[PDB]
DNA sequence: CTTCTCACACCTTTGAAGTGG
DNA sequence: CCACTTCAAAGGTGTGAGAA
C-alpha cells in the first residue's frame, strides 16, 4: 500500500525544514503531534527530506531553436497544460542578500488570428481580446538573490489554459494565436525576452512536425517513439 | 468546414517506507 | 544517522473519434 501525506502536513514539514535541519526527540514528538503523525514517520520524513546589470541565461537553447525554425505550438486544456519545452533558466548578477521574486507571464505576440491549411500558417482574421491577464509567480519566490543564482530556476510547474474561467490559476490564453512569454524580476525592501520561445496556443497540434519534435524529445511521450 | 473535449494507453516522477550500512 | 531502493499512486502526453 502506498502512503501520502497533507499539502498541509507536508508544507508544515517543509516551513520546518528551512528553519531547522534536524531535530530532537522532543522537537519530533511535538510536530507529530501537532501535524497528527506519529514520531517515526517525521523522523523518516527529515531523514528523506535532507536529500536532495542582471544576466539572464535560457538553457536548452538548442532544442527551442529547433521548435522556433519549425513554428513553435503549445497545447492548451481546461485543465491547464505544460509547456514544452520548459522554460528553464539561469540568473546571474543578483544581490546575495537582496530577497527576489520570479514570476511569469505571456503577451500576445501580434494582432493576428492565424488558422493552419497545406502546411502554412495565415492570417484569418484579427486578434480576439485576449482576456483577462495572469501572471505565473514562481514557487520559491520570493526568495535571496543567492537562491536563485545558486542553480537553474525552473517554470516547467507552469501551466496554460484556454478556460477564461479557470478556477486553477494558470495563465489563460486564446487558442490560435500567437504569443510571447516574459520573464520578471522584482525586488523586496528588470525583463528578459525570448523571441526564440515565441509561440501559438492550440488546443490540438497542427504541423505534425512540431507534434514530432515534442515526442522525441518529451520525457512523457516516450510511448509513441519507432 | 473548422476547432475544441475527452477517455485511455503509455510513460516518468514522486514520496514514504524498507533495507543495510 | 547515511544512501540507496522498493512499490504503488500520482501525474504528464499524444492519439483518435466525436463534439459544439
Redesign the pocket.
Known sequence: ?????SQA??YE?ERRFKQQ????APE?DQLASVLK??S????????????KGIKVFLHERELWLKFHEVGTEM??????????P?YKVKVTGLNPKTKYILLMDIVPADDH?????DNKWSV?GKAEPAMPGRLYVHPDSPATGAHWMRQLVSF??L?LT??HLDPFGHIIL???HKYQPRLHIVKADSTHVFPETAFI??????N?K???L??EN????????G
Do not use: C, D, E
Open positions: 500500500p502506498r502512503v501520502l501525506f502536513q507536508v514539514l535541519r534536524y531535530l530532537s519530533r503523525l506519529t517515526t514517520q517525521v523522523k523518516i520524513w527529515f531523514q528523506n527530506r535532507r536529500y497545447i492548451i486544456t481546461k485543465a491547464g497544460r505544460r509547456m514544452f520548459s488570428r492565424y488558422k493552419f491549411a484569418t516547467q510547474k501551466k484556454n478556460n486564446n487558442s490560435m496556443a492550440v488546443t490540438s497540434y497542427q505534425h512540431i507534434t514530432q515534442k515526442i518529451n520525457p512523457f511521450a516516450k510511448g509513441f517513439r
